[PDB]
Amino acid sequence: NATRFASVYAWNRKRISNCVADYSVLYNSASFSTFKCYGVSPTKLNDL
Amino acid sequence: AISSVLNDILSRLDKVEAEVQIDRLITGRLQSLQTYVTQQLIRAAEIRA
Amino acid sequence: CFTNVYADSFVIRGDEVRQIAPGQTGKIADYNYKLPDDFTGCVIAWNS
């Protein structure tokens, strides 16, 4: 929920650290079409 | 496979996305045993002789 | 030939269609309707 995103050409980066990640918040949202992963399975993200 | 460590697959993937990775490690480790047991069987014949 | 056959009938939203595929996860697949990991059969669906 940033107000305005960057363009794909100039893509933004954030270092996320020293904090707790609860991806089940993101995965339990209906809001997304796309939530596809490539070295982990999304339900396991919380166990890690 | 995405790891050499069996638990690092089972702690990162679900019960379907893991099976392909695990079957790679089974195939590789099993062919490692068939190599070793072939070497040692053949070697045994040298010691027997 | 088929030994026994069960047709399971229900309605869902169009987006939630992919959750009916075997071994998926999501609000339907978690606590409404679920296929086993070694399911045999067909998921047949149409916009209603």
From Swiss-Prot, chain A:
Outcome of substituting R4K: In strain: Mu/B.1.621
Glycosylation sites: N1
Effect of R4T: In strain: Omicron/BQ.1.1, Omicron/XBB.1.5, Omicron/EG.5.1
Outcome recorded upon mutating S29L: In strain: Omicron/BA.1
Effect of T34A: In strain: Omicron/BA.2, Omicron/BA.2.12.1, Omicron/BA.4, Omicron/BA.5, Omicron/BQ.1.1, Omicron/XBB.1.5, Omicron/EG.5.1
Subunit structure: Binds to host ACE2. RBD also interacts with the N-linked glycan on 'Asn-90' of ACE2. Cleavage of S generates a polybasic C-terminal sequence on S1 that binds to host Neuropilin-1 (NRP1) and Neuropilin-2 (NRP2) receptors. Interacts with host integrin alpha-5/beta-1 (ITGA5:ITGB1) and with ACE2 in complex with integrin alpha-5/beta-1 (ITGA5:ITGB1). May interact via cytoplasmic c-terminus with M protein. May interact (via N-terminus) with host bilirubin and biliverdin, thereby preventing antibody binding to the SARS-CoV-2 spike NTD via an allosteric mechanism.
Reported function: Attaches the virion to the cell membrane by interacting with host receptor, initiating the infection. The major receptor is host ACE2. When S2/S2' has been cleaved, binding to the receptor triggers direct fusion at the cell membrane. When S2/S2' has not been cleaved, binding to the receptor results in internalization of the virus by endocytosis using host TFRC and GRM2 and leading to fusion of the virion membrane with the host endosomal membrane. Alternatively, may use NRP1/NRP2 and integrin as entry receptors.
Name by which UniProt lists this protein: Spike protein S1
Organism, as annotated: Severe acute respiratory syndrome coronavirus 2 (2019-nCoV)
Residues of the full protein shown: 343 to 390 of 1273
From Swiss-Prot, chain C:
Taxonomic superkingdom: Viruses
Effect of D15N: In strain: Omicron/BA.2, Omicron/BA.2.12.1, Omicron/BA.2.75, Omicron/BA.4, Omicron/BA.5, Omicron/BQ.1.1, Omicron/XBB.1.5, Omicron/EG.5.1; complete loss of interaction with host integrins
Region annotation (Integrin-binding motif) ranges: 13-15
Role summary: Attaches the virion to the cell membrane by interacting with host receptor, initiating the infection. The major receptor is host ACE2. When S2/S2' has been cleaved, binding to the receptor triggers direct fusion at the cell membrane. When S2/S2' has not been cleaved, binding to the receptor results in internalization of the virus by endocytosis using host TFRC and GRM2 and leading to fusion of the virion membrane with the host endosomal membrane. Alternatively, may use NRP1/NRP2 and integrin as entry receptors.
Oligomeric and partner information: Binds to host ACE2. RBD also interacts with the N-linked glycan on 'Asn-90' of ACE2. Cleavage of S generates a polybasic C-terminal sequence on S1 that binds to host Neuropilin-1 (NRP1) and Neuropilin-2 (NRP2) receptors. Interacts with host integrin alpha-5/beta-1 (ITGA5:ITGB1) and with ACE2 in complex with integrin alpha-5/beta-1 (ITGA5:ITGB1). May interact via cytoplasmic c-terminus with M protein. May interact (via N-terminus) with host bilirubin and biliverdin, thereby preventing antibody binding to the SARS-CoV-2 spike NTD via an allosteric mechanism.
Protein name as catalogued: Spike protein S1
